[PDB]
Design a protein around this nucleic acid. Sequence first.
RNA 1: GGUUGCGGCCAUAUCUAGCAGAAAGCACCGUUCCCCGUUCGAUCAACCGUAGUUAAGCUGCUAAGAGCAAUACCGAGUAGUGUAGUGGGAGACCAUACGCGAAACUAUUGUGCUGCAAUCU
RNA 2: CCUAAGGGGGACUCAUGGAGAACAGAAAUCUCCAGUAGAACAAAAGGGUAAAAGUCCCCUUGAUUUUGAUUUUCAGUGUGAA
RNA 3: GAGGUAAAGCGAAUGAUUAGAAGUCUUGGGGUUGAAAUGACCUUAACUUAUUCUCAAACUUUAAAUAUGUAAGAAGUCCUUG
Lengths: 33, 292, 172, 159, 208
Amino acid sequence: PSAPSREVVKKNTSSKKSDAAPASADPAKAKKK
Amino acid sequence: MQKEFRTSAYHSRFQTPFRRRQEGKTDYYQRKRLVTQHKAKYNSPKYRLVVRFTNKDIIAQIVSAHITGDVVFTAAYAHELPRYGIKYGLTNWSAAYAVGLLVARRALQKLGLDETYTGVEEVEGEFELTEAVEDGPRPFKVFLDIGLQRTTTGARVFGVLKGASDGGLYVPHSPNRFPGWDIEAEELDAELLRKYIFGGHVAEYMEELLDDDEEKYKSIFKNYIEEEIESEDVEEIYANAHEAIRADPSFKPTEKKFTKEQYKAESKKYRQQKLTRAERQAKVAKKIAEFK
Amino acid sequence: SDKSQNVMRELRIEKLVLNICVGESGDRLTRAAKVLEQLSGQTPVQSKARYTVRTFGIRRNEKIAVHVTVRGPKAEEILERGLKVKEYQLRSKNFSATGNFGFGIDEHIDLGIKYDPSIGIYGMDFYVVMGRAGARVTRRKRARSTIGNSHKTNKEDTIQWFKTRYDAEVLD
Amino acid sequence: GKSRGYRSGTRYAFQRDFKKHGAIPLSTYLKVYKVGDIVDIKANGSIQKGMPHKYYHGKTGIVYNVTKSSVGVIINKVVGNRYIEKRVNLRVEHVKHSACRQEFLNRVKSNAAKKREAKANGETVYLKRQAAKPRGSRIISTEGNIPQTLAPVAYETFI
Amino acid sequence: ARRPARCYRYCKNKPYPKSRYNRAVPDAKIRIYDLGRKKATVDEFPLCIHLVSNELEQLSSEALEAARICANKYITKVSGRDSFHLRVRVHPFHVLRINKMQGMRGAWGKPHGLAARVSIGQIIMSARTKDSNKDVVIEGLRRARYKFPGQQKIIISKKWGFTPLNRDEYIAKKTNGEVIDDGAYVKFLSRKGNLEANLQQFPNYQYS
RNA sequence: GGUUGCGGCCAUAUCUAGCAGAAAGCACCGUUCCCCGUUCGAUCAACCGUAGUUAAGCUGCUAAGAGCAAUACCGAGUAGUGUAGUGGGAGACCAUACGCGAAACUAUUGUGCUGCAAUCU
RNA sequence: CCUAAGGGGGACUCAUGGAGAACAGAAAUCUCCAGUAGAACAAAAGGGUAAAAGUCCCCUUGAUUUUGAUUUUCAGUGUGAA
RNA sequence: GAGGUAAAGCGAAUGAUUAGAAGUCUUGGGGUUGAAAUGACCUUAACUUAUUCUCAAACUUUAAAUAUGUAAGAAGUCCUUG
Ligand SMILES: [Mg+2]
Ligand SMILES: [Mg+2]
Ligand SMILES: [Mg+2]
Ligand SMILES: [Mg+2]
Ligand SMILES: [Mg+2]
Ligand SMILES: [Mg+2]
Ligand SMILES: [Mg+2]
Ligand SMILES: [Mg+2]
Ligand SMILES: [Mg+2]
Ligand SMILES: [Mg+2]
Ligand SMILES: [Mg+2]
Ligand SMILES: [Mg+2]
Ligand SMILES: [Mg+2]
Ligand SMILES: [Mg+2]
Ligand SMILES: [Mg+2]
Ligand SMILES: [Mg+2]
Ligand SMILES: [Mg+2]
């Protein structure tokens, strides 16, 4: 079968963590406790 | 939670593009490359073959650019084709060829290069460029301007290209975008190109559809049915038209049922007019009063 | 004029996008692509990770997910086949402010295809892009523009259209 | 350490105008330059080929050569105790016709027109420009304009 | 530690603020610029009194802090902490440099302190209060003047509080419904923009 | 006067929210044999102009609209500045003399003009 | 430092935010909307760039040959660079 | 013609920066409701909106004065045609 791939549109050449991915910004997933 | 984006500072510092770029109509990169002339050919203009396709029309114009705006040399439209014997499919690839041939012949008539630079009088689909005649004026050189329209092998703009080239204009081009170009074996199958020039693809669709889906054939090819035009006599419609196009390529404007003044007076009735300063001031005062 | 009951204002599906974000590359992603090609009948396309996350076990440019876009009658058929698994009951918080909706099945054999132990079961993601006639304005090359406010698709219109066309329930 | 590179100190000179970045309007490429034309030099920062040196930014000179995309301009630069003739190759994006030509070339036409008419009328006309002269005598009417007396105002603080 | 202030009195250098180019700068001694009842409404304190500079000069952050403390202490002691709103109108943004803390070789100094560069007629401190509290507030500023170098004038403002309107134009705009509260400050009516929003925000606007 | 194609200047043309649009044009719109391009005839290619629609695009109008533009017994001859003195002042700085002269602010007005060709109730 | 990160052509639009979609959560992938560049362009900083100069794709070697003119530093010498 | 210094600006971009006010927390905690429902409330802190005080040699929409380039003809202009 053919294997096309999704092309790159972004320009972020750096291979690092992305913007707005901080800990403690999330709510309490166990707030129901 | 988030900042409102369309602030007054966003609008203040916004640089609007060129008017005809914001309309999405002019590619100014390509326009700069097309229009700009060698500075040592001082006032000699470059001539563009503007080819534009609408949903119903083919527009072909020969244009030179000036500071006050572009100037049309000649222009041929597809709705002129019924005068020459082509009434339906005014946006075929073959209609594109006919429009290109018409604009080429009309321009050469305007210049006086008719007897010299006749063109390809026997269209066989071979790739050919209008060669200059020794000891005579060079052929009218024109460059193709396809605008924003994509370059594909088989596109209709190159139909106008081939028609104009065969009409006697010198238009630099290569045959690798014509229908019938084998990209693997880099040669042009001139038989398929000649098929496309004389409506062969449309005639083959008529023949192939008639014996398979007659109901769709009745709706798609209605005009041919009430005109009693079958596939086998499709080609002549173009083949005669070419000859007719070469017989009298002069522009005949449509006789106008009304004068310019009558058109203007009629149209001015359906045009809203801006409120006077006093009118909107009175509106504001009334809106204030009704607020108590 | 400006009639809301105009023929050209009719809502209808633009495209249905099927997403399987298997977190890895190799045999599992290839079999997910096989599942998608089976369901849609079209060769799917593999998406690469935009960046590296150690927590998720992915790295930049590693082929992670596979997705496919279907339009026309086949999109409608796949959509109702997936709504059967959802027993025709979406939530009010499944429709976006732009008038699109989506749901997610958890096993791809509930859709109605043959199960293979080698393939296993993959979950699947369904998203439907709604739109009226004239969206070509925003997608064509020449004279590309935006769609007027009245012609836009929103959450309420899509919810009502979904309830009418499928006799389903949107759980508010 | 001193730095004296080619484009040193051109941070603001070679900047585009505010809200005027991007593509060049094509009247720049439609102008026609002939040998002997007087042209102003103003570097366009967005075209880096054929760019003038920062010395010639703001200078005016004579076209001496016309090429495919460029003109040669003659500039006289002071080097010590004399002028040196400089020959700068500039793409036409960095060049504009000097507006001082079109005003003087019009005064030449006007002088020719005035002179020929005076010969037709058998009279004389003076074509030399004159500086502004002191104004003549005049009478100021005070009907509706009786003089208003002003006085210096007292000191006040306005904060 | 600190040199006498005479070493840094005059605006001899260009402004030298904190930036990406000098980073190891200490903090200013003054951190609080609003004192007293800073939440009072505009109508509560009609009288404004300024301490105005008659000097083109530099004032250290230490002097700003000392004068602020002196004025605040005196006025709260005599009239109460809620009888006024004192505002310091100059922020020390200019970094002073010290060299010793060889010879003249490599003599570029290190950050040493912060100073505000004030002009002639520039307001240093503003105090909005009631009219009956004039003589106290003046005496609060007259003491603070001792903490500053150079000449300063105590000027009673023509305007209502910290507003840009005279004490008569403010009353005219107030009885005409063109002024609304905004906490400690006010918003004035505009004859530009959305008419409906303007009318809604100022209901008592007697239009003419 | 409307509209289209190609433009010049490049917001007085942009942006937001509403409303209207005769004729033609433009547009959306229909189809997949063919040239062609896609995960997807959505974009791109081709075919029909046939089945439909002014809903959108487009155009115009509305808004004490945002922005932009222009003007000024607006601010202000203010800030700044060239030149001068055996002027003032401990100094910091300031005044005066002969000249040049802002920006913000305030108020008012406006909201594309136009070239070539073709076409139209 | 780079056979592309040079050259030509084509297609696309970036940072980011909002609203949505099984596992999936602040960060995986998909969709729409907004988005004058708040991204990227080997490396300092500045300038420049949006149907591109950025991202992706196709073809390539003009990073070739001959020897003159010119700009900068300047003595109007050399070298470097253009 | 060119300029980006003085001045000016910051309810204009970038960077720095004082104070309240009104909203949203749904993607902050403490307390009090809740027998448990994350579904309210009091609070501070966050952001958002319209404001507010003060700034920049390596900030800027604007933008001087002084200084600076060119022109003010006979080697020019016009007419005809080699
Ligand atoms: Mg192109
Ligand atoms: Mg500049
Ligand atoms: Mg280069
Ligand atoms: Mg001592
Ligand atoms: Mg010093
Ligand atoms: Mg030594
Ligand atoms: Mg390359
Ligand atoms: Mg490159
Ligand atoms: Mg390209
Ligand atoms: Mg040299
Ligand atoms: Mg050299
Ligand atoms: Mg060197
Ligand atoms: Mg500056
Ligand atoms: Mg400088
Ligand atoms: Mg300054
Ligand atoms: Mg300013
Ligand atoms: Mg600021």
